[PDB]
Amino acid sequence: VNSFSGYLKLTDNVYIKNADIVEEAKKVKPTVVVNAANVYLKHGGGVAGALNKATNNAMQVESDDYIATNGPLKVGGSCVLSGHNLAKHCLHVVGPNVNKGEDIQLLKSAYENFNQHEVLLAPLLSAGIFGADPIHSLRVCVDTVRTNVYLAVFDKNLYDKLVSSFL
Numbered sequence: 314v315n316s317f318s319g320y321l322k323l324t325d326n327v328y329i330k331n332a333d334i335v336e337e338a339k340k341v342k343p344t345v346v347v348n349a350a351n352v353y354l355k356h357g358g359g360v361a362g363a364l365n366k367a368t369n370n371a372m373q374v375e376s377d378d379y380i381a382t383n384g385p386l387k388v389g390g391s392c393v394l395s396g397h398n399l400a401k402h403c404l405h406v407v408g409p410n411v412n413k414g415e416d417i418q419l420l421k422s423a424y425e426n427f428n429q430h431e432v433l434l435a436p437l438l439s440a441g442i443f444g445a446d447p448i449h450s451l452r453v454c455v456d457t458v459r460t461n462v463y464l465a466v467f468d469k470n471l472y473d474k475l476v477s478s479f480l
């Protein structure tokens with residue numbers, strides 16, 4: 314049993330809710346919150362901008378030190394950093410950004426990072442300002458992630474359509 318409340322069971326291991334990932338993280342304090350990161354860990358907008366703002370920019374400060382030491386991530390890759398006031402850890406995962414012309418096939422590799430964690434609070438990878446189809450992202454999630462994932466969806470109208478179109 315875990316403390317994720319009001320989620321909708323989609324499969325054995327994937328659950329979904331119309332909710333602000335910032336609020337879910339603050340309420341649940343999950344072991345892992347997933348950030349929709351880019352390879353430079355520049356948390357300017359979308360989920361990343363919102364999570365970083367909620368940490369009062371501490372996420373960005375930590376991220377800048379990480380990049381200065383290690384260099385950029387790979388598209389499809391990830392790193393584990395602090396969850397600050399949101400979670401124990403933040404798993405920064407880089408889905409392909411279609412608005413930058415990146416290969417959508419890398420979306421499955423991006424979701425494979427979730428399998429290294431037994432339970433996660435997460436956004437749909439490559440959705441929103443990343444420019445991929447959220448219905449496609451949900452399908453790849455369900456077909457790739459085997460650990461227990463709680464997906465928070467900011468947009469109410471998108472949530473309604475993700476539920477009604479899910480196979």
Ligand SMILES: O=C(Nc1ccc(C(=O)N[C@@H]2c3cccc(O)c3C[C@@H]2C(=O)O)cc1)NC1CC1
Pocket residue numbers: 333334335358359360363436437440441442447465466467468471
């Ligand atoms: O600012 C915040 N939260 C905050 C939460 C999510 C987002 C965000 O970018 N959502 C995206 C969106 C929007 C529309 C369609 C989409 O496919 C997507 C994908 C993605 C998502 O839903 O995962 C931005 C901000 N909270 C402060 C306290 C009030």
